[PDB]
Structures are given as structure tokens and as C-alpha cells.
Symmetry: C5
Subunit: 69 residues, 5 copies
């Protein structure tokens, strides 16, 4: 899966449909993987560099693959 | 969903009915989303700015949408 | 539910019956709510002020309601 | 249940059989309680004093009771 | 089980198939044990020394045994 965005988590959002949204770089992306919620918030708090891989590389795009650096 | 309150988490409360209450700004709001419990406490501890979106914007109102920044 | 004790967590204990014990003030109280385990340990570690509400306000008393400050 | 060991967590180990091993003092002990895994690692990271209670007080002994100070 | 790699976590990756990949030393290894996800990210954030034991000691190899120091 190709890299979509790389950078620090600007903000996260818990959605009504139990999905989780992350804003990295110029894109806002969501994931339906519950396990990623605490991981992503931890990355945001500690200022980790995140790389999100997805074919749906556009605002509102879904993803499941994330690299934590 | 419209913004209800924005600010830092004053306090949180675990309720008997397994719901979670948060005090942000001048409102005390609850959520039945179990996944939000650890996320909200983490935000409280680290002093993150939280934005709660809900149509039930009043004390005792329920919510599911939260922005972490 | 009335306030039982308020103060910092002196110590926590995982019990054989999968319950969680907390020592706040002069009371040792337990909870059968699994979700409260990580939350309480986090409060202990970060030195948060905790308020436990319960009608069984005595050593060995059970609780489910907790306020995190 | 009698005290077995008291001290700081030297190291932890996730085992193939989904159990969790902790080295405290001169003993290496394991627990089959999944909820204890994150709690124990947190205690290790923050340098908390841990007290493990078990009748199987010997290397390779199992436990379920832990006191966090 | 023999030691494969020892060192600090270079990076972690959540995969599409719900597995978790870790890069330690010169190897990139994965695990299908969900409980290890938060533990490994915590070790990465706090800079812990990790030792991964596996017979599949090669890039793309699977593991379940990890020592946290
Ligand atoms: O968490 C949401 C979702 O993330 C991953 O899927 C993403 C999109 O949700 C999904 O629509 C997208 O589909 C791709 C096909 O995989 C690809 O073969 C085709 O060429 O393009 C479409 C749309 O661009 O895939 C992305 C992931 O790259 C995850 O796979 C999915 O299970 C779910 O978790
Ligand atoms: O966590 C509890 C609850 O949060 C969310 O619902 C909130 C209130 O609990 C709910 O009563 C409220 O419903 C609104 C509708 O959104 C609105 O369209 C209609 O006109 O009036 C009712 C009554 O105010 O909605 C808020 C959230 O905006 C969440 O949606 C719900 O599933 C549940 O988790
Ligand atoms: O975690 C265990 C338990 O916590 C809460 O219950 C507490 C005690 O365990 C329970 O014995 C106690 O019962 C009360 C009644 O609620 C009250 O109506 C009556 O007058 O007195 C008895 C004896 O004190 O209630 C406390 C809670 O205040 C929680 O409610 C329960 O579900 C369970 O999780
Ligand atoms: O996590 C593993 C396991 O921990 C606890 O059990 C421990 C040993 O695994 C168990 O063999 C041991 O049994 C004791 C009897 O309880 C005691 O009555 C008798 O005198 O001696 C035997 C052997 O020493 O007990 C320890 C706990 O003290 C936990 O109880 C168990 O459910 C499980 O989680
Ligand atoms: O998390 C994935 C996986 O990790 C552990 O298994 C690893 C490999 O996935 C598995 O193929 C490998 O199997 C070995 C046998 O242990 C060995 O006895 C035999 O001779 O060769 C095969 C092929 O290398 O073992 C490693 C771990 O050592 C874990 O055991 C497994 O349940 C699963 O979680």
C-alpha cells in the first residue's frame, strides 16, 4: 500500500459511527479499526511522526495501515 | 453536529450505569461509548484542548463526538 | 450516591477474583468494573485527586462511581 | 494470600502461551490474567514498587494478586 | 525459543490484516497477538530495550515472545 501522508497528528476526532479520524499533513482520514484509537492518541500526545498508507488518499479517505516513528 | 463546548477537561466521572461523564467549560456531559473513557482521561491528564459536538448541549446531555487537539 | 472518600490513591491491588482494590484516605474499597482498573492506576501514577461515591462506605466496601480531578 | 516478593520490576516477558512473566526480586513469576499485562508494564516503566502475593512462591510460580505502590 | 534481535524499537506498523509489525535491529518482524500492540508502542515511546525470541528470525518473520527491559 502506498504512502498517503507523513507528519505529526494535528488532531484526532471520535465519530458518531464509532470510527476514528486523524488529521496528518493536508489530509483528514478515518479508520474503522478500534485498536488504532488509543495508539493514534498516544502518538499525538508524544509527538510521534506518523505515516499513513492508503489507496484512498483524499480527505474523508479510509485507512488501516499506519507506521509509528 | 454543532460544537457544544471547547476547553480543558475539568474532571471526569465513571457512573454506575457504565457511562462516562466529562466537565468541559460550563457543561457536564456524558457518553455511553466505552472506547472514549481512556481517551478522555488521557486528554485530562495531558491537558489537551477538547471540543465536544452534540445536539444535546446542556448539563446531563449525551455525546459521542469529540475533537482532541 | 454520597461521597465516601476523597484523596490521592495510596495503593491499588489486583485481586484473585478479578476485582480491583483501591486505598483512598482511611478506606480500602473494591470495584468489579474491569474498565476502572487502567483508569485508577493512571490516577495513582499521575497523582490525581480521586473521589469515590458509594453507599458501602467501609473497608472492603464495593463501588462503581469515581470522580477524577 | 502471603507476600512472595516486593520490589521494582526488573523485566517483563510475554510468553507464547499468552501468559505474562515478571521478574521481581529474586523470583520470576507468571500470570494468566490478561488485564495485568498493561498494568505491570506501566509499573515497570514508572518504577513503581510492586508486591506479588502467591502460594506458589518459587521461580516459574503463578500469581494473580499484585499490590501497586 | 532463541533470541532473534535485541535493541530499541525503530518503528512499528499496524497492518491491514490486523497484525503488528516491529523493526528492531536489522529485522522487521510481525505478531498476530493483539495484546502486544499497546505494549510494544509503549516500549517504543519510552525507549525500552526489547528482545524478541523467535525461530522465524528473518524479515517478515512472526513472533509472540518479547522481553521488556
Ligand atoms: O478503516 C477503513 C478501511 O481502511 C482500509 O481501506 C481503505 C478504504 O476504506 C477502501 O475503500 C480502499 O479501497 C481501495 C481498494 O483496496 C483498492 O484495491 C482500489 O484500487 O481502490 C479502493 C479505493 O481507493 O482501500 C483503503 C486502504 O488502502 C482497509 O483496507 C479497510 O479494511 C478498512 O479498514
Ligand atoms: O453517548 C450518548 C449518545 O450521544 C449521542 O447522542 C446525543 C444525545 O444522547 C441524543 O439525545 C441527541 O439526539 C438528538 C438528535 O441528534 C437530534 O437530531 C434530534 O432532533 O434531537 C435529539 C434529542 O436531542 O443527540 C446527541 C448527539 O448529537 C449519540 O448520537 C448517541 O448515539 C449516543 O451515543
Ligand atoms: O463494584 C461492586 C459494586 O459496586 C457498586 O455497589 C456498591 C456495593 O457493592 C453494594 O453492596 C451497595 O449496595 C447498596 C445499595 O446500592 C443500596 O441501595 C442499599 O441501601 O445499600 C446497599 C448496601 O450498601 O451499593 C454500592 C454502590 O453505592 C455498584 O452499584 C454495583 O453494581 C457493583 O459494581
Ligand atoms: O495466574 C496463574 C494463577 O495464579 C494463581 O494461582 C497460583 C498458582 O498458579 C496455583 O497453582 C496456586 O495454588 C495453590 C493453592 O491456591 C493453595 O491452596 C495450595 O496450598 O497451594 C497451591 C500451590 O502453591 O495458587 C497460586 C496463587 O496463590 C491464581 O489463584 C490462579 O487463578 C491463576 O490466576
Ligand atoms: O505471531 C505470529 C506467530 O508467532 C510465533 O510463531 C513464529 C512463526 O510464525 C512460526 O512460523 C515459527 O514456527 C517454527 C516452529 O516454532 C519451529 O519449531 C519449526 O521447526 O519451524 C517453524 C517455522 O519457522 O515459530 C515462530 C516463533 O518461534 C507463535 O508461536 C505463533 O503462535 C504465532 O503467534
Amino acid at each position: 500500500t502506498p504512502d498517503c501522508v507523513t507528519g505529526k497528528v494535528e488532531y484526532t476526532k471520535y465519530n458518531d459511527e464509532d470510527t476514528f479520524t486523524v488529521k496528518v499533513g493536508d489530509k483528514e482520514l478515518f479508520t474503522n479499526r478500534a485498536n488504532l484509537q488509543s495508539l493514534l492518541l498516544s502518538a499525538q500526545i508524544t509527538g510521534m511522526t506518523v505515516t499513513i498508507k492508503t489507496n484512498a488518499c483524499h480527505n474523508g479517505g479510509g485507512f488501516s495501515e499506519v507506521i509509528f516513528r
